[PDB]
Amino acid sequence: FQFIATFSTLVPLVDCSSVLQERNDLTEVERELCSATAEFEDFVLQFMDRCFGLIESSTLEQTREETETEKMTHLESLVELGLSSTFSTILTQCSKEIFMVALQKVFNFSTSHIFETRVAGRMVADMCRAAVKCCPEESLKLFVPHCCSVITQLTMNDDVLNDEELDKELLWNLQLLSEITRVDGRKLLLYREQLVKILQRTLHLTCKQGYTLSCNLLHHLLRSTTLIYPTEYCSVPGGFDKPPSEYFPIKDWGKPGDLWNLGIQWHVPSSEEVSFAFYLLDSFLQPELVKLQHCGDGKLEMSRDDILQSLTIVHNCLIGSGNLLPPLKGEPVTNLVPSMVSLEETKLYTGLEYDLSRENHREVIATVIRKLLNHILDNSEDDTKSLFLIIKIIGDLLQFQGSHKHEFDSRWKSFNLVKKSMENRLHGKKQHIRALLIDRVMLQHELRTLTVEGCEYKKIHQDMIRDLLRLSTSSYSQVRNKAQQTFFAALGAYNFCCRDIIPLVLEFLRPDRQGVTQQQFKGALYCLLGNHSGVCLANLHDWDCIVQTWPAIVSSGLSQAMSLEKPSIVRLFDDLAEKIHRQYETIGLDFTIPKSCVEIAELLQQSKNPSINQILLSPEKIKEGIKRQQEKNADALRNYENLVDTLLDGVEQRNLPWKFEHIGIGLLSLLLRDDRVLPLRAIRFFVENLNHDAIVVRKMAISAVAGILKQLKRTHKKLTINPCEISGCPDRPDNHWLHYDSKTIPRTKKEWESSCFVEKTHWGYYTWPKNMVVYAGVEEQPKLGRSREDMTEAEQIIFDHFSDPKFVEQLITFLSLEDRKGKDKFNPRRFCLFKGIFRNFDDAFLPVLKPHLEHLVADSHESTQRCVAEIIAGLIRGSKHWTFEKVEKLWELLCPLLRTALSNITVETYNDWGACIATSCESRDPRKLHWLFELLLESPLSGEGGSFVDACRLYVLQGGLAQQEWRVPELLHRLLKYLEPKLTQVYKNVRERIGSV
Amino acid sequence: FQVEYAQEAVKKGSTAVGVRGRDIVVLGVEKKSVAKLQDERTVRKICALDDNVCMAFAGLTADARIVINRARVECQSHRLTVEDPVTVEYITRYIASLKRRPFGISALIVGFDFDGTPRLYQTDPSGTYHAWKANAIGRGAKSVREFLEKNYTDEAIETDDLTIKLVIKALLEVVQSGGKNIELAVMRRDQSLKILNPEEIEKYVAEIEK
Amino acid sequence: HAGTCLGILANDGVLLAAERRNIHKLLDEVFFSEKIYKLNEDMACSVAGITSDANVLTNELRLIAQRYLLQYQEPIPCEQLVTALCDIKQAGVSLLYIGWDKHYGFQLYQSDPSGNYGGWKATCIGNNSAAAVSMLKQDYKEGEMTLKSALALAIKVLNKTMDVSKLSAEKVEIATLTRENGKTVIRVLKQKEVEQLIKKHEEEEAK
Amino acid sequence: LVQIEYALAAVAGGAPSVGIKAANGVVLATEKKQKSILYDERSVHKVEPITKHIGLVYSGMGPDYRVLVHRARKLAQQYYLVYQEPIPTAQLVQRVASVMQEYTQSGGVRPFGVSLLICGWNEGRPYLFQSDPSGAYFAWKATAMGKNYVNGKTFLEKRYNEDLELEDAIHTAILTLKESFEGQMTEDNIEVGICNEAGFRRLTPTEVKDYLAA
Amino acid sequence: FDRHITIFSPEGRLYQVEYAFKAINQGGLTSVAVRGKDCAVIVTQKKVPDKLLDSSTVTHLFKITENIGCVMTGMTADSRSQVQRARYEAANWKYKYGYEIPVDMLCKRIADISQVYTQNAEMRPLGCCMILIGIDEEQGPQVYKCDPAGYYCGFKATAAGVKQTESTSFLEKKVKKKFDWTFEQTVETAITCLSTVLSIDFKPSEIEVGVVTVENPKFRILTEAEIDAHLVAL
Ligand SMILES: O=P(O)(O)O[C@H]1[C@H](OP(=O)(O)O)[C@@H](OP(=O)(O)O)[C@H](OP(=O)(O)OP(=O)(O)O)[C@H](OP(=O)(O)OP(=O)(O)O)[C@@H]1OP(=O)(O)O
Ligand SMILES: O=P(O)(O)O[C@H]1[C@H](OP(=O)(O)O)[C@@H](OP(=O)(O)O)[C@H](OP(=O)(O)O)[C@@H](OP(=O)(O)O)[C@H]1OP(=O)(O)O
């Protein structure tokens, strides 16, 4: 099908025998083509006799006597569309002499048989639909007289209005008529008094397939008479049929199909086709709306299936004639976002006037439903299939103009599948075929029919979404799932609706509510959990929305009708919390547009080439805009610090479940900001929750207090080095004017200052920067040893906990647990906890950690050796800006401490120590840690105990020397001089280290 | 192909060292840590096969417990038909032929073979087996075997000094300071299989530290 | 992960603590053996699986527990019943095993689905196991544990792993296995005794 | 577990069946439509007895049900030959769901496309179970399978109250099939079976028409 | 690989069972059965595709027992195989239970054999369907039908083969207006059914008719001149 449709959109299928006479235009190769065109009719007729056996051997077998397979499968739906494509392209690219001899092959097949209307019903009638879309005159002369003369024979003869199962030939000839009447709607005005006659007789049947084939008849008649669409898709604009023998057809086989002078033919609805489009709407919508009106008022009391049958008529008249129907009116205001500039909705003339004076049928349906839906949800809450149709109508009362939002996306992909397949990339846009280009112009019309960018949130839209919100929270999960998808699609369309509906949807989540069902409750949490790609309604990007949704999740739980024993609701909160942490992104507090936006004044003024807007004024409204921005900057700061207080009042809430505070700490870990400092009650919280019994909370408190200490960092001062002034004299490595960066002899022992410590490794290797910047001298950095007197008296209550020995001894105890025995590594986030402690406080806590450092090193357990190693390396990389007293006082207890630890190194510990002192050598000068490099290079292979210890003692030496990569030539020699006798007499586990060293 | 997947658990399982002496044969394995709340009784890797034969292992502890309780039947189904106890080569050839896919363990089958001769074997997971003076199986087996190649000749003067300055000194090459991380086994000629309690296991390490 | 059964060993008994999980409201609250399946006169078990594959694994353990008793006229030791199923699973659900025998006293085991077991002083299997394995490692006196002190630890670590606002007093299934007057007693504790441990926890932890 | 998930698609395409456990009885109501008037409505039966006191209905594939109704009758008589007592309803479902599991386990054999609803009566207490094609089985107060069973179980949860008698459960079972019937149910279009102290029996169609007058 | 054996589709369908119903339509023939108030008639097409056929050996009506008749529609080699099980299972009932098998229990026996083809992947379904007619001792005439799926329902009138759906609509329409039949003028209902949908009705030696009655329960295939009497009066 892909093969013949890609050939029969290039070559016209026309006989060439009247050109096979005396004519000097034919070359040697071209006369060989024209004689071979005698088999073009023999191709098309043998394509049909091969496709008829492809259909009649693919009819649906009803094997199981209980069920009815009604779905055409995905593999069979492709063969419908694969034969709807590959036959409509043959039969368009085809002469009228070969058409009409092939039209009869379709008619003498599809009317002498009776097909099952499920698989072979959609598949024969699509093959007839191709026969009608190519010549609607000659094809409709014989189908619609045949089908209408046999529906009226087989329906209205007896009393087959009320029935259980229709006759399978009556039920055939509706689908043979319904899927065939969507030709160009001008040439359906010949059959007005035949199509209306059967619609007045088979649309109000009782069989559930009988009226849906009649609703599809009413649908496609309205689709054909109000849409703009191309009627022909041929490769030549005149067609292969209307000038026979006026031009030679075998020249236009490789037609590049020019975009200028395309010759495209359109179907704009005339007033004859539009007044008929309202005459079907004035004879079948309004009689089906007055029966729904008096049923929702209490004065008709229809059956459960009688309402269901009537809504399909309302749905197939709305979805199907929506191009004629204006959207709404009413303009809801006074609660949305106010603006200084225009927020007018965009308007795109998709060509039709729709005079908007007579009826406005879309507003009448919106008033019938709000009475009908108010009756059904109170008087019969069990009628599911009526509620599915009301979701389908409100889904089209709001956002349905002439095209569909998903059918456009599937024709956009089907165009790029066809365009990118057969495209001359050698010479540009000038070789795309005409059948592609006509569809892309139609894809431009269909883009304009769906490009509703701005849409004002009106008062009817305030009511129709809230009626979807009742159906998003109703009794039945089948009804809730379909209603939420319409709810979420209607939240993306209209401007500031999500601020209106968060206060309405969180009313099903408050503890104080008296009667709220479990279907009422979790249906509102599928409204928060957006479960799609369009709108996450609990994780919006505004403070006025996040200050309501995040507390209401934590306020639920502690009291609600929250069945936490049902397993689906537990997966719902675990998805609602795991969508927030995945999707959250930090919100600004200062929208201060800088003074370098004279460009905006140069764009408002003096553009003038299209700019028909003669105002050009802002005398003191720029002061009002600054004032309202500073109020926005104040409220964004205010709603941030109210969000912290409302979560802490919800996590420190009595009688919470445990599963609702892990979400509550989980929403506080996202609020820890860089431009601000976290509020005081949260600094008290995360420090006190370091010692929490739940391992999940205190794993988050480690990740939060490490960020608090980054906020409380005290901003060291810097200065600039000219590297010519030091090193005595003014090219990619190891220069003459680079010798001071290489640690060999002159290491600082007493006069530790005035040494020009370059911290990070890579500086000065290749070249020098314009401004080589190091830290200051002695005591120009901020003061280290201080007490609570000279301190920020609100943000270093963290000082009060690490001085308390009960807090520390419980913190050391929890960190030496085992979260798992296998997956247990050197945590780089407990490291950044202790790096931010000893950097910020400058070993004010190290005398309170005297036993808890010396106890953990003298332990065989790998849990405590891992616990102490994050503290050891955090001491070392916290000792960057320490005075020379505190550095020597650090290593006076630390150099015996590692020699103890490197002695008792184990199998489950050498990756911890191999990432402990290899972490502590990260961005430090090799001057400032020579106590390591005199200890680690002391005796790595002089094995006091065992041989695997000597290999693990050498692997930790490897990562420390590698991390100070080129900054040390000397210790690489001292270790090479060490190994060059020793490398002959070692064992294999040491050889695998010496080779790795 | 399928036997190569067996060996990857031998290289990660705990070490197993055996030497062979003039009068006694000694196994010794690395007792790993279990958990904080795991009773460490059911995780011992020195199993007795009959009264004159025992073996260590390294690999899957599931497939070992199949190998042990199949070799414990062939140690007893031998005595029904032969009335003599197994030679150490008989049960080693039984375990190797027992190893679809081979059972992913490597063992150190030791003991005596009814004439008082000391024996030490190894069933690699390929199905192969051969004799040994001293051997090592497990995670650091290549370096321990290189250590035992250095020390074999004049150690068998005293059966105590043979079997600590080799066996515990070979575990101490790879395993920790000891005492609670060494499970050590020793059997004399036709006496019993005795696993040394850690009150006596720490006794021998103190002589080694001196 | 479906069940939430957890074992705790003490000096004078072992205890299983499973939670009764009821998904839909129209499921019948069965009055039969719900969560703690008694294997023979001195041993019980609990599975981390659906109650259909429970009836296959427990009625296979009961064949092993009675082919032993038919053969030796003694009750089966509480490791050989664990081992014989772990040999069958070696040729797909995790279990716990509480029991008593004359050899190694009160015992607790945990069969992996691969076929591996181990003696535990306290452990968890099923839903949020590592959340409660870690909580037992915080507070368990490994040797200084009385039965009621172990029993208060169970409803402590169950109040931080299952449900909302009541610890599901009618949906938690503590069974204790003790020695009394020579025989062996297995007491699935009643709803009045299971409710008071929630009351003795909510009073002691609030005060 | 791929074919087992696909056999449940064959169950959920099947005809609706509703079971409700009352105080003193169990009701099994189902859909027995015929495609034509040519089908004899009373020739084959969907509600089907196992013992004097156990009956079971299905949703799913017709012929796969008869394999399970032939094994459940053997397993009920292999109990009765040994123990000389009518089989407990709990013990019957354990043996039927072991048979349904036995075809998922062995290869080259597809699972059954059948869920079962198994009523019963033992020791003065009613029983209603449901065996899945996976071999799983669950005790229910009231449930439904077939087409629109998600809508059925939500309909049952609003109209269940454990103090209802057996005559009140026949109404709320036909009212559950009424919601997803799509037609006009006569005495022939449905099949009801009740199980009480007197035993299991499927209702004769003249007895059902009295319940259809409500 | 779920289209080459009898396992489920992701939609829950057995494709080989559905393809086996298409194997019934490959025979090019059509059988029609109908039940009377005291009679049961089956009517087939008897196509003689070669002039060298002994036409006595081309048939689709078969005696199963002395008073249970059959008609097979579909693959001819599969049809003779499924007769042979019905020949066996109806004589095995008489030996094990001492009375003639019902048409109830013979279809349920044959359909339970046919279910095993739809569950084991090592064998295909038989591409043919059986329509058994017979007189019960207490229920009167019975017309039942097995299919390749395994369904064994009971019928007032049924059809099989290429014109199965078209013959059903002819039999539904006559079974709604009246009691669908009376006595052995029920033969005239079935012969019109096979002649309306196939649109030939050429000769009275191109069909095959078999009957069971209350007054004569044995299955007797009508002769050519015996079946010309119903066709000259048609
Ligand atoms: O509107 P779509 O579907 O998104 O696709 C647009 C592309 O996206 P954009 O408009 O920027 O959003 C754009 O391509 P890039 O900018 O990414 O390179 C255009 O390229 P351009 O014309 O500038 O480049 P040149 O002409 O190829 O040199 C068009 O590509 P061609 O067909 O090769 O170009 P032709 O339209 O044939 O002239 C294409 O027009 P179609 O609609 O026909 O696919
Ligand atoms: O010593 P390190 O572990 O390598 O960390 C340093 C340190 O950051 P911390 O405050 O987190 O310890 C520097 O901070 P100061 O000493 O200058 O106060 C910071 O410098 P900046 O604050 O100016 O960014 C620098 O970052 P950088 O390398 O970009 O200069 C960063 O190094 P890392 O980014 O590698 O961690």
Short mmCIF file of N, CA and C in Angstrom, two decimals, chain A residues 815-848:
data_model
loop_
_atom_site.label_atom_id
_atom_site.label_comp_id
_atom_site.label_asym_id
_atom_site.label_seq_id
_atom_site.Cartn_x
_atom_site.Cartn_y
_atom_site.Cartn_z
N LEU A 815 24.23 8.60 63.04
CA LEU A 815 25.03 8.57 61.82
C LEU A 815 25.83 7.29 61.68
N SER A 816 26.03 6.55 62.77
CA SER A 816 26.76 5.29 62.72
C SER A 816 25.83 4.09 62.62
N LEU A 817 24.58 4.28 62.21
CA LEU A 817 23.72 3.16 61.88
C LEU A 817 24.12 2.57 60.53
N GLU A 818 23.38 1.55 60.11
CA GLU A 818 23.51 0.96 58.79
C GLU A 818 22.19 1.17 58.06
N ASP A 819 22.21 2.03 57.04
CA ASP A 819 21.03 2.15 56.18
C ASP A 819 20.87 0.93 55.30
N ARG A 820 21.98 0.33 54.88
CA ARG A 820 22.03 -0.94 54.17
C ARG A 820 23.44 -1.46 54.31
N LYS A 821 23.61 -2.77 54.19
CA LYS A 821 24.95 -3.31 54.39
C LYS A 821 25.76 -3.31 53.10
N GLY A 822 25.14 -3.67 51.98
CA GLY A 822 25.83 -3.61 50.72
C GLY A 822 26.00 -2.19 50.22
N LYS A 823 24.89 -1.53 49.90
CA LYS A 823 24.93 -0.18 49.34
C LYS A 823 25.14 0.82 50.48
N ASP A 824 26.40 0.95 50.89
CA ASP A 824 26.79 1.83 51.98
C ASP A 824 28.14 2.44 51.63
N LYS A 825 28.13 3.69 51.18
CA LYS A 825 29.32 4.36 50.69
C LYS A 825 29.56 5.64 51.47
N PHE A 826 30.73 6.24 51.22
CA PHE A 826 31.08 7.56 51.72
C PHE A 826 30.07 8.56 51.19
N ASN A 827 29.23 9.09 52.05
CA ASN A 827 28.16 9.98 51.61
C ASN A 827 28.74 11.36 51.34
N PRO A 828 28.62 11.89 50.12
CA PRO A 828 29.11 13.24 49.85
C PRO A 828 28.17 14.33 50.32
N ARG A 829 27.06 13.98 50.96
CA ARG A 829 26.11 14.96 51.47
C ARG A 829 26.10 15.01 52.99
N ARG A 830 26.63 13.99 53.67
CA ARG A 830 27.02 14.16 55.06
C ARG A 830 28.34 14.90 55.17
N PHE A 831 29.17 14.81 54.13
CA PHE A 831 30.41 15.58 54.07
C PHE A 831 30.14 17.07 54.00
N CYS A 832 29.21 17.48 53.13
CA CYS A 832 28.88 18.89 53.01
C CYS A 832 28.12 19.40 54.22
N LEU A 833 27.58 18.50 55.05
CA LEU A 833 27.05 18.92 56.34
C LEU A 833 28.18 19.34 57.27
N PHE A 834 29.20 18.49 57.41
CA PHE A 834 30.30 18.80 58.31
C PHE A 834 31.32 19.74 57.71
N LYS A 835 31.34 19.93 56.37
CA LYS A 835 32.20 20.98 55.80
C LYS A 835 31.63 22.34 56.20
N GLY A 836 30.31 22.50 56.11
CA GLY A 836 29.67 23.76 56.46
C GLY A 836 29.60 24.03 57.95
N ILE A 837 29.93 23.06 58.79
CA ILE A 837 29.99 23.31 60.23
C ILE A 837 31.34 23.90 60.62
N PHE A 838 32.42 23.21 60.28
CA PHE A 838 33.73 23.63 60.74
C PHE A 838 34.28 24.81 59.95
N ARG A 839 33.77 25.06 58.75
CA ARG A 839 34.05 26.30 58.05
C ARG A 839 33.40 27.49 58.70
N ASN A 840 32.14 27.34 59.10
CA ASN A 840 31.35 28.45 59.60
C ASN A 840 31.68 28.78 61.05
N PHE A 841 32.03 27.77 61.85
CA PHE A 841 32.21 27.99 63.28
C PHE A 841 33.64 27.86 63.77
N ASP A 842 34.55 27.31 62.94
CA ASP A 842 36.00 27.32 63.16
C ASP A 842 36.38 26.62 64.47
N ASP A 843 36.17 25.30 64.45
CA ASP A 843 36.29 24.29 65.51
C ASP A 843 35.82 24.75 66.89
N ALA A 844 34.72 25.49 66.93
CA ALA A 844 34.05 25.74 68.19
C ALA A 844 33.34 24.50 68.71
N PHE A 845 33.18 23.47 67.87
CA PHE A 845 32.48 22.25 68.23
C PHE A 845 33.42 21.07 68.39
N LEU A 846 34.66 21.20 67.93
CA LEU A 846 35.62 20.11 68.02
C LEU A 846 35.99 19.68 69.45
N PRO A 847 36.08 20.55 70.47
CA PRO A 847 36.19 20.02 71.84
C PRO A 847 34.93 19.34 72.36
N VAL A 848 33.77 19.56 71.75
CA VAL A 848 32.59 18.80 72.12
C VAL A 848 32.50 17.47 71.39
#
